[PDB]
């Protein structure tokens, strides 16, 4: 509910985020 198929929509160092899933 949190496996790292995460989006970085802004600010594309890590430690941005979105509510995409796996």
From TrEMBL:
Record protein name field: ATP-grasp target RiPP
């Amino acid at each position: 509910a949190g496996t790292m198929r995460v989006t970085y929509p802004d600010g594309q160092k890590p430690g941005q985020s979105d509510v995409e899933k796996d």
